Design a protein around this ligand. Structure first.
Ligand SMILES: [Zn+2]
Ligand SMILES: [Zn+2]
Lengths: 115, 248, 149, 60, 258, 66, 99, 78
């Protein structure tokens, strides 16, 4: 009777932000990125991509509660490299890699058919 | 067989618990630090014959219980003749004081005599040599925490005169009060109630053990006394606590 | 400097009481000069070692040559010189017990440093002369390198 | 769904002015004597009097 | 401090499933692509059934349930239609939905087998899997009963409901030989060799490898019949790219606003 | 009561195979052979043809009219 | 199983586990094994979970009784004799006897 | 000549916090600067920490006598 609908897992509600930045106070150059209406799909790749970057001292996400559709990403870089640009670069290079992977898969398919 | 046993237990234990609760439902600890019932009839002059809450009590052991007469002598006497041992344990500016001064020697002798009296009391009170006893403050843990905080490094000669330990213990024995009042009956009750705890406190804090196994410094010992008094005060039984329901 | 101890050793027995775990084993090693016992516990999986192998164990209070006494935290982004550059197996622990054959009158002659690298134990038993740099509750490293000989 | 139940000043009986009993009749849970003994053990006399008088059957 | 250059190689291309291999990529990307294959894949399906007369023996909702699980081919229609939630009209417009109809009544003596073939769609390309092998049995009617209704189809993805789950079963597997020791076999000799295992029949598992990253992820995407396998992969990659682009745009706006 | 449309675990369509399964079992084939003849590799989809009970027949016996 | 001697974690796993810590000071501890690859140990991560400066001693379920008397008292081959100092796990494997 | 304990029992502390919270909720003047909070119970807790609660406890003895203790007079446990 109280079962939530199925659209509340991906669709944004009026007033809720897709992404919010919040600076941390325990250590310098550390911000927690809170994402709304997402799951491990959109946080694990970003975590790994940040791990690739050497200037990122810390990187990892979590799920405050499985029923709640929300994930917090904590990033901490060197003092001469803000975490915002780190997040931007991770997303940019990940997008480039996915586009290149798509192109290679497409050419491989078109060559496989009668070739 | 097991299922039938469980069914009958589930039916009998409820009645047993009900009868136990309906016989001590009004018993409580009044502000006069005494346990009475609805008719104001005193059942215990002090809750649990000590007046301490059951939450802040941990198992401990009595070092001066069940030793050997020869071992007891070489662990709580603080021999003041072997100057080499004193130089190893205490610092040079204390060995001469403990040697020349005879008041310190008499005080230490009195401490050992009191320790022997306490050992006799424990033996006549705890037959069968049961070291495992329940007391408010876990003195071993407190000593360990002091060592780990102040960085005692139990290898170097510590700066803690035995007289400091003796006077500190005596003052702490005065601060921890249960039966307030200077009346002779009041003092007798205070000594009787806080008896086992004082014996344990003296047995753990001595002039020899403090200078051989703990090596606490003056600041460390003062912090230890503060912690002990605060923990004992918190361990006191709060008046107005329905102990009858808790017992049931 | 910060070299709390420096000496060559050789392996002589591994897990005498039977290998308990699967990635860690006891190394009942011996010295060659100071004649001191060693019960180091290395990760046999990533850093395999067999009997008869010799290595240069060096307990150091810091990994820097100048000896700046690092606070203690994982900071890979660091270009400063490090003594780990010439060692194939380094660890970080905290000595927790210094047992010795002390008496009531005469000082001890043989100590035994017990250090725990987060779970990996090590007893550097020997004389009481070269263990002057070990004090309870202090950070230390291992810095061991296998010798090709 | 057949077991979930709640209450907020629902219907009252006719003999003793106390809440009804049963999920179907939209009744409240019983604050058994064992719960009373537990509350006495906690020493929360105010909470006990509230459960037994304020939210049970106030009357003058 | 950038991405990598993954490579692709198809080992088996058929009209039912594809087995490709992805090399030089991180495990997180592979697992994410898998979860997208299962969950976030646009596809058409039945989601709004109006039952007018159902004299069958099953429940009234049972018919809608079964109709919801009937796949619909959307090789070139899913990319064109828009989500009904984001539509800018009223009623299921054909520009954002596809209409269906079913009107069967058992008149003869023998029992009817109302199959998916009875779903007469208005659009030509949006039809159940009966082009080119029996049809999905919906219900059985007997002389005297009938089943008249009309339903509409819309675009959705598996994250909302299983009806929009094109992939039947994705066989994701990497490092066939237990080289990275990510799983410790108590008795390696007792386990069989993986299909992709290059190790001979003598040795049980490959030796340990300290400095070794997971690569060569194997895939066996199996299409249920609605979308072609390679089409499923392409749609998943495009959708994941779109999600990253939207997240990046939102992040840029948030940073600029601060 | 009636054969499902898809396998609960996997998701492959199995609704369009009950009649084929019965026909293959009737002709000469056995169960262990018919299942892989239809194209069911995973063991999760094979329960749908082995565990399923066909109760719709008994329901059809209670014809409303005629 | 997390506190056995033979538990090693990589930077990714460690940084992922620290996220589930409501009292983390925000500083990554020095790994127990720097080279040839930074590997933490289960006990080292669990130390950060212990608040304050706690000190206690407990014995593990599979602790052989004929071990304290003989040698190897303070260094147990079976990784028993739990020892915590300054709120940091040093030895032993945690079980019901300690938790 | 008060002989009751100089410490505040948990029962008394809870009741005082509750009563002060009730009074504050009924539009009563506070006894501490508010840092920007509104829950009356939190304000009562802050006042207790600041030792400014205008309440005095009357501990009745079994005999019948009583002692008036002020919140700013005896030591608080928590
Ligand atoms: Zn429309
Ligand atoms: Zn299946």
């Amino acid at each position: 009777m109280n079962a939530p609908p199925a659209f509340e897992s991906f669709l944004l509600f009026e007033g809720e932000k897709k992404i919010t930045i919040n600076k941390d106070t325990k250590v310098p150059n550390a911000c927690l990125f809170t994402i709304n209406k997402e799951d491990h799909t959109l946080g694990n790749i970003i975590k790994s991509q940040l791990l690739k970057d050497p200037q990122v001292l810390f990187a990892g996400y979590k799920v405050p509660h499985p029923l709640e559709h929300k994930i917090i990403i904590r990033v901490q870089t060197t003092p001469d490299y803000s975490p915002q640009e780190a997040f931007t670069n991770a997303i940019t290079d990940l997008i480039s890699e996915l586009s290149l992977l798509e192109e290679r898969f497409r050419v491989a398919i078109k060559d496989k058919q009668e070739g | 067989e097991g299922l039938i046993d469980t069914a009958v237990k589930t039916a009998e234990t409820g009645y047993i618990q009900r009868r136990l609760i309906k016989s001590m439902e009004s018993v409580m600890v009044k502000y006069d630090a005494t346990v009475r019932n609805s008719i104001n009839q005193v059942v215990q002059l002090r809750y649990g014959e000590d007046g301490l809450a059951g939450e802040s009590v941990e198992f401990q052991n009595l070092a001066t219980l069940k030793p050997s007469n020869k071992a007891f002598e070489k662990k709580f006497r603080f021999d003041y003749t072997n100057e080499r041992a004193l130089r190893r344990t205490l610092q040079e500016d204390l060995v001469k004081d403990v040697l020349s001064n005879a008041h310190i020697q008499n005080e230490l002798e009195r401490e050992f005599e009191r320790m022997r009296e306490d050992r006799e009391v424990l033996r006549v009170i705890f037959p069968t040599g049961d070291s495992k006893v329940v007391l408010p403050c876990n003195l071993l843990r407190m000593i360990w925490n002091a060592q780990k905080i102040f960085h005692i490094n139990p290898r170097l000669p510590s700066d803690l005169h035995p007289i400091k330990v003796v006077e500190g213990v005596k003052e702490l024995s005065k601060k921890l009060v249960i039966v307030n009042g200077d009346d002779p009956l009041s003092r007798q009750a205070q000594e009787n109630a806080t008896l086992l705890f004082n014996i344990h406190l003296r047995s753990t804090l001595c002039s020899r053990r403090m200078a051989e196994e703990f090596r606490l410094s003056g600041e460390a010992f003062d912090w230890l006394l503060g912690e002990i008094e605060s923990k004992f005060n918190q361990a006191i039984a709060h008046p107005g606590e329905m102990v009858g329901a808790l017992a049931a | 400097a910060g070299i709390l101890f420096e000496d060559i050793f050789d392996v002589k027995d591994i897990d005498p009481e039977g290998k308990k775990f699967d990635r860690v084993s006891r190394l009942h090693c011996e010295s060659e000069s100071f004649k001191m016992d060693l019960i180091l516990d290395v990760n046999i999986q990533i850093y395999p070692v067999d009997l008869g192998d010799k290595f240069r164990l060096v307990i150091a209070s810091t990994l820097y040559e100048d000896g700046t006494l690092d606070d203690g935290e994982y900071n890979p982004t660091d270009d400063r010189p490090s003594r780990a550059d010439q060692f194939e197996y380094v660890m970080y622990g905290k000595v927790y017990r210094i047992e010795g054959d002390e008496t009531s009158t005469e000082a001890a002659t043989r100590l035994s440093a017990y250090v725990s690298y987060g779970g990996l134990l090590m007893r550097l038993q020997g004389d009481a002369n070269n263990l002057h740099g070990f004090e309870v509750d202090s950070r230390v490293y291992l810095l061991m390198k296998k010798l090709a000989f | 769904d057949d077991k979930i139940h709640s209450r907020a000043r629902g219907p009252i009986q006719i003999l003793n002015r106390q809440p009804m009993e049963g999920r179907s009749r939209d009744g409240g849970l019983r604050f058994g004597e064992m719960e009373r003994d537990c509350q006495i053990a906690h020493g929360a006399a105010q909470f006990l009097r509230e459960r037994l008088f304020e939210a049970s059957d106030p009357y003058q | 401090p950038y991405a990598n250059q993954p490579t692709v190689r198809i080992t088996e291309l058929t009209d039912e499933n594809v087995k490709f291999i992805i090399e030089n990529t991180d495990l997180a990307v592979a697992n994410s692509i898998r979860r997208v294959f299962i969950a976030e894949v646009p596809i058409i399906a039945i989601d709004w059934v109006q039952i007018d007369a159902n004299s069958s023996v099953l429940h009234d909702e049972f018919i809608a349930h079964r109709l919801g699980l009937i796949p619909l081919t959307s090789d070139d229609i899913v990319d064109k239609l828009q989500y009904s939630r984001d539509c800018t009209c009223e009623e299921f417009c054909p520009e954002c939905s596809v209409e269906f109809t079913l009107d069967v009544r058992c008149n003869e003596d023998q029992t009817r087998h109302v199959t998916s073939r009875d779903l007469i769609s208005n659009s030509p390309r949006v039809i159940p899997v009966t082009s080119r092998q029996d049809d999905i049995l919906i219900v059985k009617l007997r002389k005297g009963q009938e089943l008249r209704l009309r339903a509409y189809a819309k675009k959705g993805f598996g994250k909302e409901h299983a009806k929009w789950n094109p992939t039947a079963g994705v066989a994701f597997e990497y490092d066939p030989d237990n080289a990275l020791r990510h799983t410790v076999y108590p008795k390696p000799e007792e386990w069989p060799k993986s299909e992709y295992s290059e190790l001979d029949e003598d040795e049980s598992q490959a030796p340990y490898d300290p400095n070794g990253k997971p690569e060569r992820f194997y895939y066996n995407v199996e299409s249920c019949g609605s979308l072609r396998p390679e089409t499923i992969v392409l749609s998943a990659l495009s959708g994941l790219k779109k999600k990253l682009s939207d997240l990046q745009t939102q992040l840029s706006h948030e940073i600029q606003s601060d | 009561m009636i054969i499902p449309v898809r396998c609960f675990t996997c998701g492959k369509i199995v609704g369009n195979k009950w009649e084929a399964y019965l026909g293959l079992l009737q002709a000469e084939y056995t169960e262990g052979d018919a299942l892989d003849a239809l194209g069911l590799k995973r063991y999760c989809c094979r329960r749908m043809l082995l565990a399923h009970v066909d109760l719709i027949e008994k329901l059809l016996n209670y014809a409303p009219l005629e | 199983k997390f506190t056995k001697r033979d538990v090693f974690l990589e930077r990714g796993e460690v940084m992922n586990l620290l996220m589930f810590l409501s009292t983390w000071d925000g500083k990554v501890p020095q790994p127990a094994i720097l080279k040839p690859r930074p590997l933490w140990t289960g006990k080292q991560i669990f130390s950060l979970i212990i608040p304050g400066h706690i000190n206690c001693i407990r014995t593990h379920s599979t602790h052989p009784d004929d071990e304290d008397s003989g040698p190897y008292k303070h260094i147990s081959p079976g990784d028993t004799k739990v020892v915590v100092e300054n709120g940091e796990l040093i030895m032993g494997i945690l079980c019901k006897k300690s938790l | 000549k008060r002989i009751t304990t100089p410490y505040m029992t948990k029962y008394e502390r809870a009741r005082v916090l509750g009563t002060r919270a009730l009074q504050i909720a009924m539009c009563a003047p506070v006894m501490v600067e508010l840092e920007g909070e509104t829950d009356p119970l939190l304000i009562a807790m802050k006042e207790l920490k600041a030792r400014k609660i205008p309440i005095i406890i009357r501990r009745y003895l079994p005999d019948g006598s009583y002692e008036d203790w002020g919140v700013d007079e005896l030591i608080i446990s928590d």
